Point group: C11
Chain length 160, copies 11
């Protein structure tokens, strides 16, 4: 099986008034290993995490070329065990094809069904292991772009 867990971002906005950009890089503590012993296995069949990220097709969202989502797993304390990084790219469409998309699919979009989202999927620990039997408590995921608009984020951990 494979249980997900929601990701909730935050960022400070201590600084002054901007135009549209944020003030810092959006980080997120995700949490895992809840009160029951149902977590990443001791030496299980190896894991394939994917950060199922969500994006709308804003014009602003469209401009940003690439942004790398990193990760770091912590164990007990401020104790990193493994890091990674994956660049990712918002999946491009032309302008004429967006006009034909919002004109052909005008029957679905005007009634709630399958709204204009473009949900990504970026795997970043293909064949993950948990060595030396120190338990992985959670992760600190972090995207490095001050100008990004995203609804929410899921984190699939998955077996094989």
């Amino acid at each position: 099986v494979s249980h997900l867990s929601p990701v909730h971002f935050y960022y400070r906005t201590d600084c002054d008034s901007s135009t549209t950009s944020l003030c810092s890089f959006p980080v997120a503590n995700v949490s895992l290993t809840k009160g029951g012993r149902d977590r990443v296995l001791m030496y299980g069949q190896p894991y394939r995490v994917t950060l199922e990220l969500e994006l709308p097709e804003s014009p602003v969202n469209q401009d940003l070329g690439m942004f790398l989502v990193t990760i770091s797993c912590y164990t007990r304390g401020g104790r990193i065990i493994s890091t990674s990084s994956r660049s990712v790219m918002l999946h491009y469409r032309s302008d004429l094809l967006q006009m034909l998309d919002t004109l052909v699919f005008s029957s679905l979009l005007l009634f709630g069904f399958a709204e204009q989202k473009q949900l990504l999927e970026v795997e970043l620990y293909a064949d993950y292991r948990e060595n030396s039997y120190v338990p992985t408590t959670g992760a600190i995921i972090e995207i490095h772009s001050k100008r990004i608009q995203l609804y929410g984020a899921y984190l699939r951990i998955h077996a094989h």
Copy 2:
């Protein structure tokens, strides 16, 4: 059951004349635990608060990418017991689809029925508890964007 309570914002505007933006971050004391003992339970079935927020599709409102709504529960005095934060995103639509929306639904919008609102819903204490039996008097909710246009706000506290 689940009773709501209205949220009334305020902000200072002590400063000089702006273009369209506000002068500070819109905060709000909500109030709870009224004269009858009908409040957040002692150790009840756990709570799921949602801040049902209201937004119109202004152009100005549309530009702002993300804004994080925070919360802080106070007990007796200036005594925080729990905080949180959720980023949230105004739900995007394209311009051609807005033209088709205000052209197809021209029979409903010109007669009061289901006007151009885009009411959000952002849960921020999924499975809330009230530990150590100090009573929660109310909350101080606060959105961190000086440029935001919103009608009103409800605060569902809800059981399971």
Copy 3:
């Protein structure tokens, strides 16, 4: 029953020539408790005041995002007894829907019937009381925006 009373604004304009904005915040002494003893009751059924405010759909009027209307009740002298504040928002419409509004309703608007007004209503003492039996003489209502265009204002005090 429920008697209203008209509100007449004023503001100084001592300063130099502006473009369109005013010179100070529009305040207004409303007056109550006239020569007969027909005023806010001693311990009556509690009151629900609404400041029925009037606005035209100017472009200028449309730009302003939010503005908070405050209130302060005075008793005898410069003696405040209760204050409040409510932010309020001019009720948004798109531009294409305004073109369809002034095109579909061209039979009513060209003959005086139901002209292009957008009268607000903002309650600000839902369940008002008059405690310690000091009489409320009137109110000082005040909107905090130097750039606002409004015809007039009524003040419903209402029973239950």
Copy 4:
């Protein structure tokens, strides 16, 4: 009955060449209590003055948001007895409705009948009295906007 009296404005224009604006605030001595004893009564049925003001729909006239017309009644010498103030607003119309107005009513406007005026009416001593039996000689009415275009002005004093 109710007799009116015409109002004739003046203002100095001592200053240099402007673009379109005036040089000072348009004041006007109106005059009353003529050679026969037909004036504001001693203790009559109380009065309701209205300053029936006249305005054309210039673009320039349209921009100005609000302007407060004041008043001051003088008795014998430079002796004020009563003052007031009323803000007033030029009654708004959209641009598309002005095009439909000057297109639908093209049969009346091209032959003199009911030309493009927008005559206001602003009451400013609803239930006026004349106390202590010092006679009111006239009034000094005054509008506080250097940029205003108006044909003429009548001053209804009216009984009940």
Copy 5:
């Protein structure tokens, strides 16, 4: 009966080259009490002078909002006996109505009949008297706007 008399303006233009404006305020000595004793009567039926002024609808002429025409009557020497002042306003029309005016009335305007003039009429001594039996020789009429285009001017003195 009522005899008129033509008014001939002048102004200095001593100053340097302007764009379109004049150099000073257009004044005019009108003259009266010619070689026969046919002038303003000793104690006649009282007079109502009107300065029938002439204006074309030039764009430059159209911009100017208000201008006050004054007057001063002289007796024998530089001896004023009476002054006045009346603001006056060029009678407004919209642009679409000017297009319909020069399109509908294309049969009259292209053959000399009733050309595009907009002759004003501004009364400024309604019920004029000539007291103390010092004879009024003439008048010095004067309009206070450096940017005005006008053909000519008549001065009706009229009986009752």
Copy 6:
């Protein structure tokens, strides 16, 4: 009878290169009292001079609002006997009416007949006399605008 006489202007152009304007005010000595005794009479029936001036409808010519044509009659030497001044105005037409004028009258204008001139006529010694029997030799006529385009000028002296 009434004999005319042509007027020939001149002006210096000593100064540097301009855009379109002239360098000084266009003056003109006209001449009269030729070798035969046929001139302004001794005490004749009084005269009415008109300076029949000629103007084309150039855009540059059209902008100029008013210009005053003066006059001065000289007798023997540099000896003025009488002066005057008349403001005058180029007779206005709109742009749409000029398009209809050059479109409707396209049969006359393309073959020489009645070309696009706008000849003025400005009387400036209505009931002229020649007192003290010093003979009037001629006149010095002069228009005060550095930016004016005119073909020629006739000077009617006329009897009654």
Copy 7:
């Protein structure tokens, strides 16, 4: 009879590179009294010279408002006997009439016949005499505008 003589202009262009304008005023020695005694008569029937000048309707040529062509007759040496001056004006046409001119007359202009010239004619010694019997050798004609485009020039001397 009446013999003409061609006029050939020249001007220095010593100065630096301009945009379109010339460098000095175009002067021209014309020459007369050739090897046979056929010149301006001793006391002949008086002469009427006209400088038949030639102009194309270039836009640059069209802008220039007025320009005065002068003249000076020389006798033997640098010895002026008579001068004059005539202002002259390029004969105006509108733009719509130029479009109709080059559209209606498209059959003549595309085959050489009567090309787009606008030849002037300006008389400048109407009733010329040759007094004191000093012979007039020729003339120095001169137009005072640095920005003028002209093909050629004839000089009619003519009898009566």
Copy 8:
């Protein structure tokens, strides 16, 4: 046979907020010679590596003219054995042909099939050898353009 291996880029973004460009050159450690002895052969049939690179037709992506992808093979430690370099060019199309491409292929692109990618292929060790029998552990591939948008990258090693 021929096994591929995925390439994952990274780059620092330590620097401040840019417009669209990156902060450094995108490098990538690829890895090879896994836990089984299936790697580049000792003296095998020689190899032909191709870096199958992926690009979308973004306007930003389209501007960049050429960019050289380099390579360096490392053995054991920071020990380069072989380098290369190949310039490469995004395969050009005109704008009218892109409009015809997204109009003709509108049936395939609106349903997921064969989306607007332009996957390159650039061979850079045509006839590769592994001399002196020091094993090649992996490669450090690197493209030298700070402004490039690319999804992913495969690295074919291939036999003959």
Copy 9:
């Protein structure tokens, strides 16, 4: 008879890079009196030289208003015998007539026949003589405009 001779221009271009203009005035030694005694006659029937100049209707070529072509005949050494000067003007056409010219004559211009040239002809020694019997070797012709585009030039010497 009348023999021509080709003219070959030159000019230095020593100076730096310009936009379109040349660097000096285009001069040309033409040559005459070849090895046979066939040149300008001793006292022949007098000559009429014309410099048949060639011009294309380039926009740049079209702007230049006038340019004077001079001449100087040399005899033996640097020995001028006669000079002249003629201003000349490129023969004007309007823009609408150029569109009708290149549209009506589209059958001739697209096949080589009578291409868009505008060959001038400017006579500059009408009735030329060769006095004192010093032989004229050739001429130095010279046009004074740094911005001129011309193909070639012929020089007709012609008898009568």
Copy 10:
């Protein structure tokens, strides 16, 4: 026979971020005389090398007027034996003809066949010889333009 050999360019890009241009001139070592004795002959039938260069019709590529491709043959060491240079020009087309090209050939271009390339061919050793019997190892070819977009390059050496 005639064997070709591929050319692989490189250039440094050490410098900072440009707009579109490169950082240095694109040079290339080509290599020849491989492990078998099949190279440029001792005294063979003479050679005709052509550098078959490849170019796309970018707008950017189109602007560059001329660029000279040079060459230098090296023998053993840094030892040049022969150099050359040929300017070359991208083969021009108009814009309307490019629109007709990508519209008429829309059946071939949308399916891979004969894509929008413009492959040049520039011979630069027509009748090449290899004198003094020092062997030519290869060549260093080099194009001198920092702003050029090219896919690849072949180098035909060819016999006769």
Copy 11:
């Protein structure tokens, strides 16, 4: 007979990055008198060289007004024997005629036949001789414009 010989230009481009212009004047050594005695004759029938130059109709090519191609023949060493110079002009066409040219001839231009070239021909030694019997080795031809786009150049030497 008449043999030609190809001309190969070169120019330095040592200087920095330009926009489109070159860095120096394009010179070219042409070469003649090859290994067989077939060159310019001793005293042959005289020669007529033409430099058949090649030009495309770029917009850039079109702007340049005139450019002079020079020549210099060298004999043995740096020893000039004869020089010349001819200005030349790119043969003008209008823009509307270029649109009709690339529209009418769309059948020839889209298939390779007679592409958009405008090959010049400029003779520069009409009746060339080779005096004093020093042999002419070749020529150094040179065009003086830094902004010129040309494919190639032939040099006809021709007999009579």
